[model samples]
Target: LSEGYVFGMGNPLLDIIVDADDFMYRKYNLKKDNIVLAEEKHMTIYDEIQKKKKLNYIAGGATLNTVKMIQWIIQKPFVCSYVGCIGADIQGKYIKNDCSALDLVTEFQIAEEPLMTGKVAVLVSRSMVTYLGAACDLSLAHIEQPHVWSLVEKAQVYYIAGFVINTCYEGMLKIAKHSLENEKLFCFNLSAPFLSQFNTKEVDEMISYSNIVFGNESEAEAYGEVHGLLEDTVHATARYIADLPFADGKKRKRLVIITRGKNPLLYTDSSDSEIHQFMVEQFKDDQIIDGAGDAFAAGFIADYIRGKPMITSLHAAVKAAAYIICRSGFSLGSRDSYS
Candidate 1:
């Protein structure tokens, strides 16, 4: 949240990754491939998920992951900072230390109430299923803080993950309005299927102000159907978003990027008036892990802040994404001794 730091807001979480079997799912009432928000009692289920598998902790959240990469690539002390709430627990301290190593600042509130820190169990079987034990317990009161609102208003670029909407809608709405009034670049991500379709109306409200929006092919398909785009291709859906109207006759820098796993990356901007696609570097199945899109968006934003052209920005985005996919968790430098 600095000289043009790419400011972002979302859940700030530490992920405990492990490989689990069918019994783990049954014991937790977890549905396959769905991101379930764990209830307080369900928070204790992490012990069961880690039964036979080794545990690995990585700091992640959709927007925080993006912000971490932006700072990592930019290599500046405060080039990127993320805002959210976290508990005053050991997990919270661990997350802050991880972000500090990336040279990113944490604009987070330490929950006054005695709540557990936010975390997720990244369970891998045949497919990845994330179960979140969210303990931020955010409210409009936190968003109304003078210091927090100042961070929202001062940033030149704002990134908001859709997952945050479930936790802090009013805060994000205020940020969106502030960005529009100041003509700042506003970026939004279609972070999940439930948010893209079930929360269609609120997401549409956000699109009216977002300068750039990101999603995957599947989320794009759901969004297109929800908004009546009727497009058979993800590129078609991207084009529709790039051409949408903005407030105050703002000369739109409208850009939309959608990634198709293992397929070409799709994107469009008002500058070209044409949708474009570029193939991503191929990677073996086992090498890739989660957080690819977050890295991609962060690289693009880093390039954008450097005044690179849209196509070049896309290349950097793809390169950074590929880097993360080839590794595990959000990392800064050479892969060694990860926590």
Candidate 2:
């Protein structure tokens, strides 16, 4: 693939992983194994967590992680380009350094002072508190800049996480428009269930522009409920989404893929009446890790861009996700050892 052939845009977050004690959880009023957005009451926990004995940081964000993993699998420099907002803080610098180490090209807009880089506090006991911070500052103006817009123009494929709807709906919309005008492939993920429940309009708009849509069973169920699907099963939702009118006026077929945990994944396209099923490898509860969806997106895109057949691409997607499910936190192993 050529340089900047694949583009992604979304929030950039630094994951602060720590092993916490019961006292800290009680102080934060956090429930074990639960994930919540950071509220005013939880603001101080970011700084307070630094005092812990063991601390680890990872460059994370749904789209960013997927883009990096795509680069890792393809082993090609500059094949993927990313844009997002970050603060001019140490955490932001760390994220940049980490991406560079992976050879993932980025055009990050720096947020103004007093708005620090976004971060997620991952309590190893399994609680997560997310602070969007500077991620919310991403604006269409930055994306419209000549240099940044050039990256958008150079790409044949684009992927954006639905989580970005909370931050910059306009930015994603603009990219969607460009993709439509150019007839490029635009991929989107229904990142979380809440997005389908609350950001229904934005999610629907993105799906219209998307050539391929990805979501897990929970997100699919939430979307199906909100849309009042007559038969709200995962299979029905996949078919419904696949059949939705494309913003490009049928310039291309829309593909919808829904992942069912421990069950066969369902996929269908506008041109196909039959929904296809592919079984995924089962994993123990303890072996499963985060970022499997992101990895799946990366794998599918990497192979699809190489002109691989649909079955090959799907197999690659499943293999990519399996690799992450067996690893810790979205960490990539040696490229030579991937197969």
Candidate 3:
């Protein structure tokens, strides 16, 4: 195969939302902050959150968001694997059907047990705060070795996060290791702040081996300090990424990329000691949002497979992200538009 891609090894969760002025009343009872983990808890929150304003439903999950953006932008054949459990019931059926309509090849491991499949509630007032609900408890506890290798064998690259390491260390480690041994490229996100500490070690062990690595502003700050670089956000990010040693052997050089909201994105060379900057083409709008990073990652992966130069790939990513942020839906551009 000339080219192959992976969208996710994440749960296909449904975003069941409830946006309103307030979630407090005598008839409405739900733990305002805590996520509902069980079926009854989900119902309780769903009922209360739905009483005044019926919540909107949408398909969402970290990797899914990224791939949805890529599906529209990349003009190439792609294959995505989503590893999670869902029932043969209604929501599950809808998830499967919608994903297919979007050209995502999904594999839902059906669960016979009392699992509520993946779902979250979006609570909005002047802004929005999402409350996660039952999601089939899908974790590394459920991942099988064969299940992972199948994807790794079919894919030329593997993208994941340290949050997966925090939730399921052994499983993510095993998968990451296999990806390394098989010579598959790895893309990583140092997601959670708490994970930064533990995942920093994971990053230390894996970054040298990864073709790509990233962190948020705080993550860039933390990783920069760990590497003992200048404290400013841009330099801190530049040092962490550039300082990574990826060319110790005869392997191809590795690259590091970092994005800042309303700022130029940064790229580093694991092989070159010097820092190089790559900026996106000027965009027309500035109303940014959270999922822009996911969309950017999707665009990068798609452009990367096309053998575009790093700088060009980065711009495609940023422009795609700009499009995603300009719109309200998570997947702003369709598969046809981005390509």
Candidate 4:
């Protein structure tokens, strides 16, 4: 792949990861395995975690994680270009340095002074408290600039996470329009369950523009409930989403994939009546980690862009996800180790 062949735009966050005790969770009003935006009450947790004996940081955000992983797996520089907003602070510099080290091109817009870069406190038990400080400042004006818009225009594939709706709906919509007009592949992820329930209109509009839609079983079920699907199964929801009319009015069929943790993943396309299931190898409970969905998207797109078939891409997707699930966090191993 050449420079800027794949493009992604979304919030950029620095993940502050550490282990916490039960008291820490209760004191912060946090629930295990749940994700929430940071409130005033949660602000102190960031400072509190910094005092911990062990700490780790990763360049994180749904789209950023996926794009970086794609660049890693493809073993190419400048193959992926990303855009997001961040404050001119140390955390923002860390994220930029991390992306550059991974060979991913970035066009990050700077937020005005005083606001800090975004950060996510990722508890070892999988709970996440996000503070999207400067990430929320991503503006359409920044995306419309000639330098930034050129990346959008030069891309053959575009991806944006659903969380971006809260930060910049217009930016994602603009990219969707460009992808549609140019007949390029536009991929969208139902990042979390709340997005399908709370941002239905924006989510629907993105789905209509998306050539491929990715989500987990929980997200798929939430979407099914919102749309009042007769059957409440992942299979039914995947088919329903795949069958939805495209906004572009083109003959191309939309593909929907719903990943079921520890079970077979379900996928379908508008042109096919049959839904296919792909079984994933089981991992030990302790080995499972966060960011598997993001890894899956990276793996699939990396291979799909190289003209690989759906089945081959699906295998690659599972392998990519497995790699993350087995690792401590979203850390990637050496490229030569990938089979």
Candidate 5:
């Protein structure tokens, strides 16, 4: 892949949101401690989650949201590639159409599994926040190495939201190795909490290989512990993170960026240089919600492609997130919002 992308390489799925809250008790058997389950084979919890609780659901996925917001803000010719398997059914087509709406180019492959098009059962409850359960799991069986690589090769750069490490295990490693071997720049988002079942080996391997990596407070702390460098300041932690040498041969010089919410996105590039700081907007409509970080990554990518420095790209990331926060849910937006 030879174009720029903010965040991608995760599944761009079909969201069959069930307002599962109303039925959470009726389908009481469906309750599984923390997660809400659909006992029956063909039940939708979209309305259950939505109608029952207060909230949202408009095209959710790590890569999809980031790329779509980038497309909205960047608003020019660019490549947005997505790879995943969906049943050759309506849900699959819906996923395809949604990607198209974002001006994204697709590399979706179809599988014959009993699975419907990929989806997430977003269950936002009374006490708890949105619990993304079952459907979000993009099983490994669907990933074809050949097809996945083809999509990866087509892009100028690869964007990984950490969730992909859990969702598509080997697929994550494969593409990562490809970028390393190919001498392409890799950018990653610490899109999940590392402690909760993530592929640390691949992630650590990626640290040096990555040109830029994004993370917030908790994610930053987790990486600090993993590398045994839990220093207090982000600058000190990033210095240690950047200094802990990785790859065997000519290793890629890297940057570890720790973003403090509404504060500067602290960064330490390969140089024994100073940390770069880029901040988020202080307030927002409903407080900017979930995809802000991902959108920021998208902005940076779009800026990088247009020949901006890594520092400037980061500034662009801040702006992209600002665009999303001022608007509605996920990445859905009209050109007017970006304008």
Candidate 6:
């Protein structure tokens, strides 16, 4: 409380997960395995799920996942704070309560347009299709709010999820600028393929300011392609990201973490001249979920902040992620879950 905290900004989604099939997707006109904006017609689809009484709710959105993991893994309170927009509804209260239960602080703006908090309809058919709605309306006033900006200013580390690029670009930029001006550690994630392909300008802008970067293999490759790097490989992309100069010059430690599902953690950082891969344990069939990546980021960054070495940080990441994968939702069950 005296020194600093991690400030995370992104969409806060209350995920309504349900098991469905192609029939349900076809009924809703949702594309397979892709996350798309919810259309007005999609409200009918939501209503149907509500009627079914099988909804499995969880606090989602990439940044919130990372924020929760950081606090959980570090076993610290008030070390992490999240900023996002929601609606004055049950989903909003659910997310706030869930975060509070994890000992994570939240700063949220209740957007009036949608009239309900944002939600992601997670349909796990033969494959999964996530329909996101109302999460993208984080107004500029939320960023400009004195209370919110004060939290941003007091941060030692700032994290922005790429999915928020299109919706909260201004907010992201304001924090990015703050990170640069204060020589604080700035981090960004390439959340999805579409963002790496479409949000090039804002993504690049954040990348240039970021001291630490996170993404999966696809996102890493896509970001490499977006930047016109010659090699279309994750290792090359890691090099490219690690090589980017920070505001303080090239001597400062910078990191690029490229996560491969159930394989090994590959990374490059200013502390080394070559990329390194550390073996990590993988999960089973039903255990796999989106929380792992966020946990990995949290684990790595938390240790890195403690001035741990590359392998040490990566190990913490894998450990943190393992805890999440073993749990039922995107949360820690208890402190004993760690040991």
For each candidate in the order shown, give its overall lDDT on alpha carbons: 0.74, 0.87, 0.59, 0.89, 0.60, 0.76
Write the residue-wise lDDT of candidate 6 on 1-339 in tens digits. 333388898888887878775588778776644566666766666666776556788888888888777777677787888988887788889988888888787788887765677777777642233444456678778788888788888889888888888678888888887898888889888888778788877776787788888888778778777777756477888887777766445477767878877667687786778887777676675222256778878888888887898788878888877777787656667687577
Best by TM-score: 4
Task: Provide the global lDDT of candidate 3 against the true structure.
Answer: 0.59
Could you tell me every candidate's TM-score relative to the true structure? Answer: 0.87, 0.94, 0.77, 0.96, 0.77, 0.89
TM-score of 5: 0.77
Clash pairs, candidate 3, are 71-335, 72-334, 72-335, 73-338, 73-339
How would you encode candidate 1's per-residue C-alpha lDDT over 136-232 as one tens digit per residue? 4666676678876666666798899888777787778888888888888899888876787778877877887899888887788888887777747
Write model 2 residue lDDT over 1-339, tens digit each, in one string. Answer: 889999999999998999887887888888744556799999998888898876988888889999999989989899989999999999999999888988888999999999999999988767788899999999999999999999999999999999999999999999998998888989999988789888999999999999999888888888988888758567778888888887767646898888786778888899899999887777877321247888988999899889998889988998898888777777888888788
- Better by lDDT, candidate 5 or 3: 5
Give the better candidate number (2 or 3) by TM-score. Answer: 2
Give per-residue lDDT, candidate 6, residue 222. 81
Return whichever of 4 and 6 wins on lDDT: 4
Model 5 alpha-carbon miss at residue 182, Å: 2.2
For every candidate structure, what is the RMSD over all alpha carbons to the true structure, in angstroms?
Answer: 3.4, 2.0, 4.9, 1.5, 5.2, 2.7
Name the regions of candidate 4 deviating beyond 4 angstroms: 286-289
Stretches off by above 4 angstroms in model 2 are 21-35, 286-289
Question: Which of the two, 1 or 6, has more lDDT?
Answer: 6
Residue pairs with clashing backbones, model 4:
none
lDDT computed for candidate 4: 0.89
User: Model 2 reaches what TM-score against the true structure?
Assistant: 0.94
